[PDB]
Amino acid sequence: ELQEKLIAVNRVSKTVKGGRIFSFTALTVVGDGNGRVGFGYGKAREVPAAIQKAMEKARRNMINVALNNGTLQHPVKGVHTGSRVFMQPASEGTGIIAGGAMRAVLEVAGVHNVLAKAYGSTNPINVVRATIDGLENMNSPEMVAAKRGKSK
Amino acid sequence: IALNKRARHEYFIEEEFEAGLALQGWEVKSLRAGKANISDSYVLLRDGEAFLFGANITPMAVASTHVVCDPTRTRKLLLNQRELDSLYGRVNREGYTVVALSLYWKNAWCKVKIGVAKGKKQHDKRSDIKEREWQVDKARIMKNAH
Amino acid sequence: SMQDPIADMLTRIRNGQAANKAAVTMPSSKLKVAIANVLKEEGFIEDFKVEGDTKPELELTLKYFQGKAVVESIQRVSRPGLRIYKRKDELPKVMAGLGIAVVSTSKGVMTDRAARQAGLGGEIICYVA
Amino acid sequence: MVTIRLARHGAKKRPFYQVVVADSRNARNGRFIERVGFFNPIASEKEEGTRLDLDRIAHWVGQGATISDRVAALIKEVNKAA
Amino acid sequence: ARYLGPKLKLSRREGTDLFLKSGVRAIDTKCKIEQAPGQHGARKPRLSDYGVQLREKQKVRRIYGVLERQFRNYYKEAARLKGNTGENLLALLEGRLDNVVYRMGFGATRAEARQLVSHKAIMVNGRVVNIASYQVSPNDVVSIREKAKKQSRVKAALELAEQREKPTWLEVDAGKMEGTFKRKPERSDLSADINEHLIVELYSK
Amino acid sequence: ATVNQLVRKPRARKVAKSNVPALEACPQKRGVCTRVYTTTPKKPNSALRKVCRVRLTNGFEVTSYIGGEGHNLQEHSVILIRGGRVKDLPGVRYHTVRGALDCSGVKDRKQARSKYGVKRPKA
RNA sequence: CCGCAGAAGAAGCACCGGCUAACUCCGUGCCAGCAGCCGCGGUAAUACGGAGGGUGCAAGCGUUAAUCGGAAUUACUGGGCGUAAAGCGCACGCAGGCGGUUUGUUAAGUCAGAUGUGAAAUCCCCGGGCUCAACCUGGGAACUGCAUCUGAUACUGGCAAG
RNA sequence: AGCUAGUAGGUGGGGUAACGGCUCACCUAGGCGACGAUCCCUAGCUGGUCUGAGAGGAUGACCAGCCACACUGGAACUGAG
Ligand SMILES: [Mg+2]
Ligand SMILES: [Mg+2]
Ligand SMILES: [Mg+2]
Ligand SMILES: [Mg+2]
Ligand SMILES: [Mg+2]
Ligand SMILES: [Mg+2]
Ligand SMILES: [Mg+2]
Ligand SMILES: [Mg+2]
């Protein structure tokens, strides 16, 4: 029900005096399908501990979205460290087209139809953060109406 | 001089002598000129006084356009009785492995300048083995994806 | 130097929004007051007032529904270096109808929906959303 | 000379004829001026397959379009004016 | 080129209720069927992505008897048409004449229905056809010619037909070997044992 | 980046050389090997490699690697080159189609018969 | 199309360490050898050769040849110039590009309406016939273009005033 | 980075089925060119085709329209063409 899924796991090194301390880092996302998307990175000495810590971190700091019935109400562009993401409402289209490290996060967010493309360095963590920031910056028509004096 | 640059850069030669070898007319008449491929000849124990192994025959155009002359043909080293059992014992419990080094000529015989080289240890693969283990772990840990 | 008054006005508006300024003042002109009117029709700002006769000064007051600025994005389109003109029905709709692509048409200044309803076109001054 | 004739465009063993106004200096598959319609040889004689424009044919004949044997035969097959 | 060869191994490669052989000879989990227990039995490597989609495409293709190129042509036609690509694809797959015969019961298995269609044991609207790829339109009638009446082939198929449930769009009488196909199915009536949007994602890739 | 600069000099695309210039947009080329020999490889793959220098019909001499274990190739041989480069051999960017008028398949090879010329045996 | 004996007369290719769908054994032992990359192979190779077994397409499978895409890697939509490639050593200035505020007038750029035209063929949509298809064909739209006649004067611009 | 003087134009004749330096005699010394003149290399063009969501990139396989050619080159006649 919590719609949890990780994206990639990578191992790191410390290069200590006695050799190398091989640790592990994770990347997980959590959601339900009506917003409430969270992410977690997670570090540990072992892969299972790292992914558990990533899931626990994703459990908190969960930010909601103002999604339409199955997509966004407007195209959006998200920018981050070295990754740029473009989202288009893409009505019907019997599904998404997004690629790695991005299709996972929206299938977690629950939006079935969306045109998602990534320009720039394809760092999973950076593209996920860019997508989260773009979703946060996205605004709903009801919100903009109440802000601006709808009169529509 | 056919110095065998591999055996020169690794495990310097220590002992050698002079002797010919037996061969047929197909794989001959080009060693008189000098062309050959004797880089790191893998000479191992053979009942016939450690028959020459490893080194192939020169790729000179003496081919009958089917094969060069002999993709794999018997090559015999020459020793009356001095190094069969001793060579077996040295390979077993010393670390010295006899390999062919050069091809000197008495102007008639293509001499097998076999050299008894020391078995040198491999490079520390203790980083790439762990890299491969991490790669297979990454390939296996992709289970929780739907 | 001063190659575009509209771009300067947009930049001053954006800087005031960034700095949380209540009112921004500038020299005034007919095009500037027309853009101010077309923005106030959709209520992107509080109000614009032009004072003075020898040196006409226009001052615009920024709306604030909350801590976040009411206007988030504003971009000049028809810059002096490249003019933009679209057909009757080919005008752009920013954010699928959320925001206004200000357009000066044959009748005058109006928004994208007004231009589509009037069935004409012109130059796209700036996107605001 | 300007004349109305038939051009073949169908696939092998299944021909298809189009009736059209074309100058005789061109070829059968060559250029033309104005299309008049089609006459299917097999004709799939449950549905249509014979559609000519007698008004255009008459207009071009008035200007000097020489009627061809096949065009006259098709006209006699369908009707003089029906 | 209809697929031919082993079927139990083919089914156990995936592990599903795809369908079985018409005859039954101890069809159960005796010792090793699809999830073989005892000293071995690794069934699922659990591939990350696109693997389940490939498996779904393969199981769909082997159930319906269609080849990859024709299946992709059907997918392209479905995407070109309106509605949902998956349901349009399923509609074309069911409109394939062999599946119509199988679901009407004259085909004991889908392979047997294809064999009958090829051997001209089937006719549509009073006309023979020997193409298992023919698409049937709604409000039509498909009959069996008098030659196929005397087939223990067909007798066993019609006997086995009435052990299953019956569809929303087929009404068949065995007193004349004739079936009326009225409407086209939908995802609701179709078995919910596969996902269509994953297949859509795969060939849209 | 300025529009006036673009108008005064349009932004042009960078030419890209083909990895097999000696083919000149042709699937294969025919020549006879001027020499067939063996060449010492690079650092990690010290395994000996077999090459031949062959002068094609276009007047260019190129070096082509020989695949398989055991080669049915020599000098004065009418060969066929298909293209393809090996990163392990320096300055080698061609491959020989074994089984084209002067070459047989790999001896005692029962796999990749299509790729190595041998026909499928009866038994 | 109707009859005739019998399944009787008709399956191969590539791959199986990650990219990508597929695992075990035998032998060689940086040798022989595979490969697009990562990269393998120094006694235990799911990677080499063979064998067994699995996977992907199938009367077609793989290699190679050329274009685009992914390459936002010539980027106008849609890049950057302090340290990764990138601000001329500095200044003047012509052609050139752009241009402060207000009024009137021109209809040039721009916008609207209408006409002719954009050959046919081909893409597409609605249908039809070849056992459905491939293929052919009817109608329609489109071919965003071009020129002409009349209006719009907000903006850029020609002219006259500040 | 300059080219061209039958080359830019005019005055009259001839010539062309018709306009015109197409040509002749004279006069005027201009004409083209930084929006690329002149010169070098390459190239049949278009409807279209492929690849692309798009703008774009490649190309002119089949078919259709047009152009040019018929061993290389030059010239004319017949014929309405
Ligand atoms: Mg692209
Ligand atoms: Mg590009
Ligand atoms: Mg850059
Ligand atoms: Mg620098
Ligand atoms: Mg400086
Ligand atoms: Mg300098
Ligand atoms: Mg004259
Ligand atoms: Mg040419």
mmCIF file of C-alpha atoms in Angstrom, chain E residues 16-205:
data_model
loop_
_atom_site.group_PDB
_atom_site.id
_atom_site.type_symbol
_atom_site.label_atom_id
_atom_site.label_comp_id
_atom_site.label_asym_id
_atom_site.label_seq_id
_atom_site.Cartn_x
_atom_site.Cartn_y
_atom_site.Cartn_z
ATOM 1 C CA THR E 16 0.581 -19.846 -15.176
ATOM 2 C CA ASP E 17 -2.941 -20.977 -16.104
ATOM 3 C CA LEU E 18 -2.151 -20.172 -19.758
ATOM 4 C CA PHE E 19 -4.162 -23.222 -20.895
ATOM 5 C CA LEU E 20 -3.619 -26.970 -21.059
ATOM 6 C CA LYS E 21 -3.955 -29.867 -23.469
ATOM 7 C CA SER E 22 -7.516 -30.941 -24.235
ATOM 8 C CA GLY E 23 -6.941 -34.531 -23.132
ATOM 9 C CA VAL E 24 -6.166 -34.905 -19.430
ATOM 10 C CA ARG E 25 -3.825 -37.651 -18.165
ATOM 11 C CA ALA E 26 -2.996 -37.044 -14.487
ATOM 12 C CA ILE E 27 -2.869 -33.241 -14.825
ATOM 13 C CA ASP E 28 -1.827 -32.273 -11.296
ATOM 14 C CA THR E 29 1.216 -31.641 -9.121
ATOM 15 C CA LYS E 30 2.343 -35.269 -8.921
ATOM 16 C CA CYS E 31 6.058 -34.631 -8.372
ATOM 17 C CA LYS E 32 7.344 -31.921 -10.779
ATOM 18 C CA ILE E 33 5.017 -29.835 -12.958
ATOM 19 C CA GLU E 34 5.777 -26.099 -12.866
ATOM 20 C CA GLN E 35 7.282 -25.479 -9.410
ATOM 21 C CA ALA E 36 9.275 -28.737 -9.076
ATOM 22 C CA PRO E 37 10.001 -29.511 -5.412
ATOM 23 C CA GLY E 38 12.874 -31.633 -4.190
ATOM 24 C CA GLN E 39 16.638 -31.002 -4.293
ATOM 25 C CA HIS E 40 16.136 -28.262 -6.922
ATOM 26 C CA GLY E 41 13.388 -26.134 -8.439
ATOM 27 C CA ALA E 42 14.684 -22.590 -8.889
ATOM 28 C CA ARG E 43 11.718 -21.043 -10.709
ATOM 29 C CA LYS E 44 12.190 -17.267 -10.831
ATOM 30 C CA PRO E 45 15.512 -15.380 -11.051
ATOM 31 C CA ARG E 46 13.348 -12.290 -10.424
ATOM 32 C CA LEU E 47 14.543 -10.064 -13.259
ATOM 33 C CA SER E 48 14.401 -6.325 -12.621
ATOM 34 C CA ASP E 49 12.561 -4.827 -15.595
ATOM 35 C CA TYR E 50 11.489 -5.505 -19.196
ATOM 36 C CA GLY E 51 11.871 -9.191 -18.379
ATOM 37 C CA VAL E 52 8.369 -9.643 -17.037
ATOM 38 C CA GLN E 53 7.157 -7.642 -20.055
ATOM 39 C CA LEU E 54 9.024 -9.960 -22.442
ATOM 40 C CA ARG E 55 7.562 -12.953 -20.600
ATOM 41 C CA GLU E 56 4.049 -11.494 -20.904
ATOM 42 C CA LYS E 57 4.522 -10.919 -24.635
ATOM 43 C CA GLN E 58 5.855 -14.452 -25.091
ATOM 44 C CA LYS E 59 3.043 -16.094 -23.113
ATOM 45 C CA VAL E 60 0.478 -14.009 -25.016
ATOM 46 C CA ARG E 61 2.024 -15.041 -28.340
ATOM 47 C CA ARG E 62 2.272 -18.740 -27.489
ATOM 48 C CA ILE E 63 -1.313 -18.833 -26.172
ATOM 49 C CA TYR E 64 -2.731 -17.208 -29.305
ATOM 50 C CA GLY E 65 -0.402 -18.951 -31.780
ATOM 51 C CA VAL E 66 0.665 -15.649 -33.349
ATOM 52 C CA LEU E 67 4.257 -14.911 -34.357
ATOM 53 C CA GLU E 68 6.292 -11.906 -33.241
ATOM 54 C CA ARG E 69 6.066 -9.939 -36.488
ATOM 55 C CA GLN E 70 2.297 -10.367 -36.825
ATOM 56 C CA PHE E 71 1.857 -9.581 -33.121
ATOM 57 C CA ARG E 72 3.829 -6.356 -33.568
ATOM 58 C CA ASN E 73 1.722 -5.502 -36.625
ATOM 59 C CA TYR E 74 -1.388 -6.014 -34.488
ATOM 60 C CA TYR E 75 0.114 -3.798 -31.780
ATOM 61 C CA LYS E 76 0.833 -1.070 -34.333
ATOM 62 C CA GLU E 77 -2.734 -1.289 -35.649
ATOM 63 C CA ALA E 78 -4.066 -1.077 -32.086
ATOM 64 C CA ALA E 79 -1.917 1.978 -31.324
ATOM 65 C CA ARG E 80 -3.076 3.590 -34.574
ATOM 66 C CA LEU E 81 -6.709 2.952 -33.619
ATOM 67 C CA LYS E 82 -8.494 4.760 -30.789
ATOM 68 C CA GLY E 83 -9.270 3.540 -27.272
ATOM 69 C CA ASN E 84 -6.700 1.632 -25.243
ATOM 70 C CA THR E 85 -3.821 -0.049 -27.063
ATOM 71 C CA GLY E 86 -3.927 -3.165 -24.883
ATOM 72 C CA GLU E 87 -7.641 -3.851 -25.250
ATOM 73 C CA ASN E 88 -7.521 -3.140 -28.991
ATOM 74 C CA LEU E 89 -4.650 -5.636 -29.207
ATOM 75 C CA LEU E 90 -6.629 -8.186 -27.185
ATOM 76 C CA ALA E 91 -9.662 -7.517 -29.392
ATOM 77 C CA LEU E 92 -7.612 -8.256 -32.518
ATOM 78 C CA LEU E 93 -6.115 -11.365 -30.898
ATOM 79 C CA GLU E 94 -9.579 -12.702 -30.069
ATOM 80 C CA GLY E 95 -10.930 -11.689 -33.485
ATOM 81 C CA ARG E 96 -8.296 -13.940 -35.010
ATOM 82 C CA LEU E 97 -10.393 -16.771 -36.419
ATOM 83 C CA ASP E 98 -8.560 -19.617 -34.660
ATOM 84 C CA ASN E 99 -9.314 -18.228 -31.199
ATOM 85 C CA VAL E 100 -12.942 -17.777 -32.265
ATOM 86 C CA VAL E 101 -13.162 -21.489 -33.101
ATOM 87 C CA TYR E 102 -11.389 -22.434 -29.867
ATOM 88 C CA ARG E 103 -13.720 -20.320 -27.724
ATOM 89 C CA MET E 104 -16.734 -21.657 -29.651
ATOM 90 C CA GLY E 105 -15.520 -25.153 -28.736
ATOM 91 C CA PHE E 106 -14.940 -26.709 -32.158
ATOM 92 C CA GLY E 107 -11.220 -26.512 -31.388
ATOM 93 C CA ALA E 108 -10.180 -28.808 -28.537
ATOM 94 C CA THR E 109 -6.939 -26.859 -28.219
ATOM 95 C CA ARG E 110 -5.969 -23.614 -29.918
ATOM 96 C CA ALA E 111 -3.443 -25.562 -31.996
ATOM 97 C CA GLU E 112 -6.229 -27.990 -32.937
ATOM 98 C CA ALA E 113 -8.460 -25.064 -33.920
ATOM 99 C CA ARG E 114 -5.666 -23.693 -36.114
ATOM 100 C CA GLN E 115 -5.255 -27.152 -37.656
ATOM 101 C CA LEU E 116 -8.988 -27.353 -38.417
ATOM 102 C CA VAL E 117 -9.033 -23.826 -39.870
ATOM 103 C CA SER E 118 -6.113 -24.753 -42.122
ATOM 104 C CA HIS E 119 -7.772 -28.066 -43.104
ATOM 105 C CA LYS E 120 -10.985 -26.161 -43.970
ATOM 106 C CA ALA E 121 -13.114 -27.594 -41.163
ATOM 107 C CA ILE E 122 -14.471 -24.067 -40.673
ATOM 108 C CA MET E 123 -16.528 -21.676 -42.802
ATOM 109 C CA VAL E 124 -17.650 -18.076 -42.262
ATOM 110 C CA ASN E 125 -20.987 -16.685 -43.482
ATOM 111 C CA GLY E 126 -21.283 -19.654 -45.839
ATOM 112 C CA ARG E 127 -17.756 -19.391 -47.239
ATOM 113 C CA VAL E 128 -14.686 -21.536 -46.573
ATOM 114 C CA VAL E 129 -11.483 -19.913 -45.286
ATOM 115 C CA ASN E 130 -8.111 -21.536 -44.587
ATOM 116 C CA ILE E 131 -6.417 -18.620 -42.749
ATOM 117 C CA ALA E 132 -6.187 -18.673 -38.955
ATOM 118 C CA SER E 133 -5.521 -14.921 -39.078
ATOM 119 C CA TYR E 134 -8.952 -13.853 -40.377
ATOM 120 C CA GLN E 135 -10.650 -11.153 -38.301
ATOM 121 C CA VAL E 136 -14.366 -11.650 -37.623
ATOM 122 C CA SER E 137 -16.724 -8.671 -37.437
ATOM 123 C CA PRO E 138 -19.613 -8.315 -34.952
ATOM 124 C CA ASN E 139 -23.095 -9.639 -35.800
ATOM 125 C CA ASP E 140 -21.668 -12.484 -37.919
ATOM 126 C CA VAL E 141 -22.298 -16.237 -38.167
ATOM 127 C CA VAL E 142 -19.668 -18.954 -38.627
ATOM 128 C CA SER E 143 -20.707 -22.482 -39.603
ATOM 129 C CA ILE E 144 -19.028 -25.875 -39.953
ATOM 130 C CA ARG E 145 -19.308 -27.521 -43.374
ATOM 131 C CA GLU E 146 -20.850 -30.967 -43.773
ATOM 132 C CA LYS E 147 -17.465 -32.669 -44.240
ATOM 133 C CA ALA E 148 -16.237 -31.735 -40.755
ATOM 134 C CA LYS E 149 -19.431 -33.066 -39.141
ATOM 135 C CA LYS E 150 -18.251 -36.695 -39.221
ATOM 136 C CA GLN E 151 -15.014 -35.975 -37.293
ATOM 137 C CA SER E 152 -14.426 -37.624 -33.916
ATOM 138 C CA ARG E 153 -12.113 -34.610 -34.087
ATOM 139 C CA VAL E 154 -15.065 -32.253 -33.623
ATOM 140 C CA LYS E 155 -17.176 -34.598 -31.482
ATOM 141 C CA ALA E 156 -14.573 -34.612 -28.697
ATOM 142 C CA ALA E 157 -14.080 -30.848 -29.031
ATOM 143 C CA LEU E 158 -17.803 -30.152 -28.646
ATOM 144 C CA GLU E 159 -17.943 -32.590 -25.723
ATOM 145 C CA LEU E 160 -15.102 -30.748 -23.982
ATOM 146 C CA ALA E 161 -16.598 -27.333 -24.816
ATOM 147 C CA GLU E 162 -19.481 -27.626 -22.337
ATOM 148 C CA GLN E 163 -17.240 -28.343 -19.319
ATOM 149 C CA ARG E 164 -16.026 -24.718 -19.345
ATOM 150 C CA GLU E 165 -18.071 -21.547 -18.840
ATOM 151 C CA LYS E 166 -19.403 -19.681 -21.874
ATOM 152 C CA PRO E 167 -18.573 -16.231 -23.285
ATOM 153 C CA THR E 168 -20.451 -12.944 -23.550
ATOM 154 C CA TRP E 169 -20.352 -12.815 -27.372
ATOM 155 C CA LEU E 170 -20.610 -16.368 -28.787
ATOM 156 C CA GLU E 171 -23.804 -18.422 -29.072
ATOM 157 C CA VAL E 172 -23.253 -21.822 -30.690
ATOM 158 C CA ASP E 173 -25.641 -24.665 -31.490
ATOM 159 C CA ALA E 174 -24.204 -28.151 -32.025
ATOM 160 C CA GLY E 175 -27.343 -29.425 -33.745
ATOM 161 C CA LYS E 176 -26.100 -27.541 -36.815
ATOM 162 C CA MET E 177 -22.454 -26.792 -35.841
ATOM 163 C CA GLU E 178 -23.063 -23.055 -36.153
ATOM 164 C CA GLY E 179 -22.112 -20.119 -33.961
ATOM 165 C CA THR E 180 -23.186 -16.478 -33.897
ATOM 166 C CA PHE E 181 -20.563 -13.894 -32.907
ATOM 167 C CA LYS E 182 -22.448 -10.808 -31.727
ATOM 168 C CA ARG E 183 -20.127 -8.359 -29.935
ATOM 169 C CA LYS E 184 -16.459 -7.857 -29.109
ATOM 170 C CA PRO E 185 -15.012 -8.738 -25.682
ATOM 171 C CA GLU E 186 -13.398 -6.423 -23.138
ATOM 172 C CA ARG E 187 -10.774 -6.599 -20.396
ATOM 173 C CA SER E 188 -13.515 -7.258 -17.826
ATOM 174 C CA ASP E 189 -14.575 -10.539 -19.434
ATOM 175 C CA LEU E 190 -11.027 -11.411 -20.536
ATOM 176 C CA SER E 191 -8.938 -13.375 -18.038
ATOM 177 C CA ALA E 192 -7.013 -11.121 -15.656
ATOM 178 C CA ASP E 193 -3.768 -13.090 -15.742
ATOM 179 C CA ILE E 194 -1.547 -10.573 -17.574
ATOM 180 C CA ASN E 195 -0.819 -6.839 -17.755
ATOM 181 C CA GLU E 196 -1.261 -4.937 -21.015
ATOM 182 C CA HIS E 197 0.472 -1.635 -20.301
ATOM 183 C CA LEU E 198 3.796 -3.391 -19.621
ATOM 184 C CA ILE E 199 3.612 -4.913 -23.112
ATOM 185 C CA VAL E 200 2.700 -1.458 -24.429
ATOM 186 C CA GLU E 201 5.785 -0.028 -22.707
ATOM 187 C CA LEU E 202 8.049 -2.724 -24.157
ATOM 188 C CA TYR E 203 7.289 -2.180 -27.838
ATOM 189 C CA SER E 204 6.964 1.589 -27.364
ATOM 190 C CA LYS E 205 10.563 1.338 -26.105
#
